């Protein structure tokens, strides 16, 4: 099997995103500490969870972040 997801993570830098395989799921945890903006301060955080299909090796799961702010999590077909 394979795994392939694309995510918009526009407010987060690579160091603010944590991807992990926990059980039968791929978890994405993005968090940024308080930062200034036009009107005040803003801190943001999200947690996304996707299931990992049976024929996919958790060790084959890679993650990359594009200069456009698109996070792609993939596991090539086995």
């Amino acid at each position: 099997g394979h795994f392939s997801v694309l995510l918009d993570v526009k407010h987060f830098s690579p160091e603010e995103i944590a991807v992990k395989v926990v059980g039968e799921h791929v978890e994405v945890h993005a968090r940024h500490e308080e930062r200034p903006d036009e009107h005040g301060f803003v801190a943001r955080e999200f947690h996304r969870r996707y299931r990992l299909p049976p024929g996919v090796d958790p060790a084959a799961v890679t993650s990359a972040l594009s200069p456009e702010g698109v996070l792609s999590i993939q596991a090539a077909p086995a």
Partner: peptide, 9 residues
């Protein structure tokens, strides 16, 4: 639990 490095690209 296995960690997945976020590769800058």
């Amino acid at each position: 639990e296995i960690p997945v490095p976020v590769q800058p690209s």
